[PDB]
Every structure is written in C-alpha cells, then in structure tokens.
Design a protein around this ligand. Sequence first.
Ligand SMILES: O=[N+]([O-])c1ccc2nn[nH]c2c1
Length: 305
Amino acid sequence: QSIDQLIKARGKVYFGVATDQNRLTTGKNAAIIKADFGMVWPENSMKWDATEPSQGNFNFAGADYLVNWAQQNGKLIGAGCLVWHNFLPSWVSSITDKNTLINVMKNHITTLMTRYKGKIRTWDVVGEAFNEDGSLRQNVFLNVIGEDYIPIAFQTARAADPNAKLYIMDYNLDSASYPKTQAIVNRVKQWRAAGVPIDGIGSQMHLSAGQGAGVLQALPLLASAGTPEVSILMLDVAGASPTDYVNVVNACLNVQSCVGITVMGVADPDSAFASSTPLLFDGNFNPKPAYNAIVQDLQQGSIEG
Ligand SMILES: O=[N+]([O-])c1ccc2nn[nH]c2c1
C-alpha cells in the first residue's frame, strides 16, 4: 500500500521523499516514488553550492531533471534551501559589503524561484537560522546584513513566486522543552506580526532512536507560532523502529496545520547514515517493518468527537 494515498485519505497533503536524478535512474527508486510518495524534494540539486557555484553562474541541470520528472509523474515538488550557512560557496561567505550581500541573496532567491515559478509547492527560504540556545546563528548573512536578512529573504521570495508556500526550517525542534523550539516559535510569531511572509515552519527530523514520542508535543508547539502550515522534513530515524515512525506520523495527524511528511530518502544504503538503517526500505527495496507499521496506522481510523 501507498503511504501517500493513505495519508491523503486522512486529510493531509502528502507523504514525500528527497531524491534526485541519480536515484531516479537507479535501483527501484522511481518505481517506489511513483507508487508510494506524492511529493519530491531535491536531495542536493537545489543547494547553493549546486546551483550557483560562482557568482551569477547558475547550474540547473540537476534541479531541472527532478522538476521535470515530478511534473511528468504528477508529483508535488518542494525545494530549498535558498538561504543557509550550509553548502554555501566561499564566494558568498567572503562578502563583507552589506548591500552587495543583500543583492547576492536576493538574486539567488529570485533566479531559482523564477526558473520554476508556479511549479513548486513549498520553498524552504531560510534554513538553520538558530543557535541551540535560541539566539540567531552568526552566519555570513547575520554578520554582514544583520537580523533583517530573514525578513528581506522572505519578502524577496514572496515577490518572486507568490504561489509558493514559504518556509523557515530548522533541526533540533523535536522537544517541546528545548530552548531552540520555543525560540523559533517566538521569532516567527513576531516576524509574521510585522508582515513578514512566513507561511510555514519545517522541522528537520533526523532522529535518534526513541525520539519519535517527543514529537507528539514538539509539533503542536511549533504550530502555535500561527503559521498557516507546518511540516516534517528530512525524516529518518536511527534503527527505523516502527514505534518511532508511527509516533512521528501520528504527530502530523494530530496537528491540523501539519500538511505532510518528507523522508530523507527511499532505501537504507542511500542514506548518509546507512549504518543506522534509518529509512523505510531496505537494501533490496523491500518495505521494512516501519513502512508496514505506518501503513497499519494510517488504515486504522481514530474515534473523533
Ligand atoms: O525534506 N527533505 O528531505 C528536504 C531535503 C532537502 C531540502 N533542502 N531544503 N529543504 C529540504 C527538505
């Protein structure tokens, strides 16, 4: 059974997966994605160091392949991350002039979003902007531009493609009592109050065993920022326990504004954390216990009021 179909039947938008051209042309990835997933994200091909490796020199072959494959196969597309300290070329992080960095950031945003205008459901505009203690991360953007870089990025994105849902994403938002979780909620509330167009918070859920249960409290806390959407991104779970995975899925189901879940890949050998066997399919492309547990969970209705 298809977990995407099953989650749609429970009123959600999608169950998605990260992929790219290499995956689609090897293994059984394309067959599994066609059958079982409803949204794709580029694993690597939309990163800044993939797409703009030197100034104004855009590389779109990989991203184009994924977007076209998704279109041809009737899948939604998410993409990102546009402004991120990760995977950022040294030509960017060496800029010291404020107006230059502002325009470099804006052109990166606008060029990527314009190319795919109208085709992308969700853009992750700003990623990993917070320190663990909840203060803003001192990346090049914060150091050179200051905290206005976040509002500027979102407004620029809204202008470039008003159809897209614009997200901020971060990791270690998996515990309701952790400082980072409350801090992103607080900052997003105040950005939105000031007119900054943040449509979603995406929680990047690279989990260790046993962390699924806590998401049942963290995800509702994230939703309390009042964004129209929240989502689960980059999901994998060390050990791939059915209990962890079912708890994450149920957190999504419990949170009205949660639109869906994206897993970080299809099969274990293709994970960056392969030795932790953290995905839903094994090295034979058979569904693992966790996949089947999710299927059982989604088939079984809850008693609603
Ligand atoms: O959910 N995802 O797996 C995922 C992968 C790569 C991304 N880049 N920006 N957002 C992303 C989400």
